[PDB]
Design an enzyme around this catalytic site. Structure first.
Site: not given
Ligand SMILES: [Zn+2]
Ligand SMILES: [Zn+2]
Ligand SMILES: [Zn+2]
Ligand SMILES: [Zn+2]
Lengths: 334, 328, 332, 339
Positions: C249-250
């Site tokens: 996940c960014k």
């Protein structure tokens, strides 16, 4: 969070060595440290901002400041001196520092002209005034700004479209003697400060300042100087009792807090009180602030940066509300 | 919830009916009904109690009451008169009605004796006093109870082991003229009331009343008269700044709120503020109350009965806290 | 407050006499009134809207709906039938009623084309899907939409720039038998509904749907299907444990709730939980809704109108958030 | 705050060290440290307690533990082994360490007898069970404890008058395949754990467990496994809709949360969610817990010690609720080795 904006941030005039030391001795455990920091504009102040994720601060003159000066000519001269001083002192760091106007509030027309002068000439971001103007031949009186004779001033504020920060002042004169002298540890942040500002702000509400001047933005420090605690109670007594008995302000207290009033987090680093205010006031009307150097950056900023709240409101309260309200240019890490 | 207890519940003397009706013009939209209800003890009052699930109320003399009387002899006579009156007036309803003592607070020994008299003779549950006692030339002076001269009184309060309810009164005299006359819609519940009581209560804190009298229980209405909102701010300034500079009270503000202070829900039917107070103050020190007849039973009891909070705290605040505190 | 907007508001096809009877036997005490109200589009529904200050409602197809149909062609045909039916039924009330697309989610490309058809032809304001698509023989399989093969569908959703409302569905097949049959009073609002939606929505987060499609807006009912209660706990386990161990996940879970997710008040008329959500989610991302006719207008609207909260957020949550998100035009 | 009490605090058997270190690879960034700490009883564990103001912890067998074992004879033998092991391991520190019973939950009478054995012989403080018991072939079946056959067990629990801690367990088998394999980052604390326990606990409620055993105390970790978020929503749907249609439990969900249920702060160091729970549940039914070693002491204890809430509720949640519920020794804090 980087690029926070704070705007209850005081300075003193360096020549006022005795006054600064007096106030420092009442507000700080290390008064020489306090004096050094309230006098400093560009060195330690910016180092703290760099250290604690603050992109921009709007500076204002110490309390009681011009509002302690009961001679109108002396008060006006001090306001002009302060405004010219701080405009010059912050000139090297327009990306980090702005200023609020300091005003003598003895005469509405005079205050309007000086506000217009320094907003136009220096790009000041609004005004900050330390509650009522101490007045009278011997300093025993006080001037409130909620009567219609202040319309010429409030119309200037709204024409310039800049906010007015209603900051506390210590109690003076017969009020000081009768109520506070014998419980003097309550003077300042513990109680007296909020009692003064909340009286004046709710005077502005109930005496029609925001009805005559619906665009006016008034900012209150210290999470609203008690008022949100009683938002339910004030609203119930205004709507259900006082207005039937003649109170004629057009809006509810909640509507004035939606359209005209703001609160800041200055000197009130309380997660529980902030959460309560998310309900009673709303994140769109709450602004981060510190109350430096009465408070230190580390306390305010470690608390704020640590808040486990939603990212939208954290950004709004931390910087984006102020960026829009004060029409801020791109500043450091904005 | 049935069996609720309320204890900021006012009455006035029937002989003052015209005066009572005149003053009610500023805080009651129906002053005739207000005068009738504040003068009534056992009829409409108990009917409201039965209809809205209130098992027990402790009655007190209306504000400003004796604290408006700046002549000491007249003040003392009125307090005596009110105490005897209300003891007699409630005597047929011991299971529904109690009373707080009414006192002239011009003189600590005098007030201590009258409190002892009516607590022992009539079983009064404590004292209720409308903030400072007017005194001096033309009643412009104010007597606060946080000075050392009041130790003899507070010692009698703890000897009897009954609480003292610090109720507001309107601003008067030069203070009224300087601060309130030009913004008079703020007089009473909107602002002036809480400003007076919080000044006086925090004077008791900082001037060491609770250190000299650690048994003393002080009850505040209206969810604590602003104070819990600033629990963090007061605590920080007391502990980190004022005490290093010389403030000598022995406990923190949070410690006084656990040991000596209580707050009621009188006139503050705010689920939002109550929830905030659950954290800052704690359900064990919060008491339901109404502020009748300035508030009506239906507003207070519809709100409290509908509170969607946990069962145990709701029962503590609604009745069990007060049952134990006042030994009902 | 007047002019409120609600958008978890259901209808059924009037020809489905028994499938409406079944669903009502689990979730309604008056199956007659339920059937009558869920079938109605312009009469009692607008009467309620008028009595309770609701200016506009976005209507959606009842659960489980098309997601209950494991035969793809029967499922696609129902979504087309439903979409044409409601667009016609609401055409004489454009100031009061809108609609969400109903979709068969057996195939990303098929679903995408039907969403584009009804958004373009009828001006639907988004899509509403009842969690996973039943599939396979007997319908015991489940289609989730967090895999890369759904990229072409989410790319359509962001091109159209309309939200996707992820609604619950009942538990079925082997999962129903193993977990729910012997505690079946927990089926629906009590527990099963939120467990399904939260699994799917957090699947979208952790399988990168919002990283590949940063403009996508997903709406959850019922104040977020448990998730805000664990915002601290999910954030801690994602940032401090799952991400050092591979989670890519960014953004943080809070950042996804700021940029991609929304919650509504459907069936959750809880002042306590709303106040909690003002902190954990924020008023800018919360929408009033009712869940009519499973809930009635009076409960939702007397609660909302009575809220003693600040005026800015009361207006935003009550109508102004939805007006902006669904590009609603002048209505009342 | 010194003398805090925590009670979702796990250990594993030393003979499983290799298996323990392997499985820690998915939920610990330093699995060697995790294995060393979950296997230790009296050294590093007590050192952390000393450093962080924790006077007393109640220990329990790690998940999935005996609930992973679907052969009944193997599972019973493991539960007996674990109980005897931990009783011996903690015996020198009665003012620092207690233990919950580890149980095989294949058969109610067998579990009741083992609970009675170790509460009586060892002074165990209750039971901790990792949700459903794996059973059947391949261990793909699930034994829940809300059916009538478990009444004999719950009567033993109330006769001994000790609480039962309903702890989560990873999804396994077909349910894992169908729901969690393709979104495996949600397994554990993020979502799967709470979904399991809340289903099981609300099964106990709706199937009348607390009506047949009104003195039964069930403890839930992680601030109640989502349930308080939906207290209003569950109450509305139970009282207004499901009970008319046939739900037969006798009390409201709020009444069960006042009378039979407890929540702990394990792995949920959220001032926001705690404050919410003060309203929905109340400080009298909330217990401090850490979830060590999945969580570290520093995270739990710096948070709890820093909480700005009223003094009385802070003391109740931090230690005084647990001191009474689990009958801790008077003066236990004299051994807290505080810094
Ligand atoms: Zn300041
Ligand atoms: Zn009163
Ligand atoms: Zn729905
Ligand atoms: Zn655990």
């Amino acid at each position: 969070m980087l690029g926070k904006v704070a705007l209850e941030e005081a300075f003193a005039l360096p020549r006022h060595k005795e006054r600064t030391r007096w106030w420092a001795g009442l507000f700080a455990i290390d008064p020489d440290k306090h004096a050094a920091e309230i006098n400093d504009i560009t060195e330690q102040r910016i180092k703290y901002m760099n250290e604690h994720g603050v992109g921009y601060t709007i500076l204002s003159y110490t309390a009681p400041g011009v509002q302690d000066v009961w001679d109108p000519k002396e008060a006006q001269a001090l306001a002009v001196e302060v405004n010219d001083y701080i405009a010059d002192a912050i000139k090297a760091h327009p990306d980090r520092l702005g200023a609020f106007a300091t005003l003598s509030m003895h005469d509405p027309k005079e205050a309007a002209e000086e506000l217009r002068r320094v907003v136009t000439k220096y790009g000041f971001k609004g005004a900050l005034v330390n509650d009522t103007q101490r007045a009278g031949a011997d300093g025993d009186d006080m001037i409130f700004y909620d009567g219609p004779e202040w319309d010429v001033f409030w119309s200037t504020v709204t024409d310039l479209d800049v906010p007015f920060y209603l900051h506390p002042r210590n109690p003076t004169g017969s009020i000081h003697e009768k109520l506070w002298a014998k419980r003097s540890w309550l003077i300042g942040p513990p109680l007296s400060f909020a009692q003064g500002v909340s009286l004046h702000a709710l005077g502005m509400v109930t005496n029609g300042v925001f009805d005559r001047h619906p665009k006016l933005q008034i900012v209150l420090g210290h999470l609203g100087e008690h008022i949100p605690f009683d938002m339910w109670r004030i609203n119930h007594w205004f709507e259900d009792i006082k207005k039937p008995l003649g109170l004629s302000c057009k809006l509810t207290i909640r509507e004035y807090f939606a359209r005209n009033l703001w609160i800041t987090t200055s000197g009130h680093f309380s997660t529980s009180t902030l959460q309560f205010c998310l309900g009673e006031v709303g994140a769109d009307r709450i602004l981060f602030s510190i109350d430096y150097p009465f408070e230190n950056f580390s306390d305010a900023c470690t608390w704020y940066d640590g808040l486990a709240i939603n990212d939208v409101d954290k950004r709004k309260i931390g910087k984006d509300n102020a960026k829009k309200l004060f029409k801020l240019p791109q500043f450091y890490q904005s």
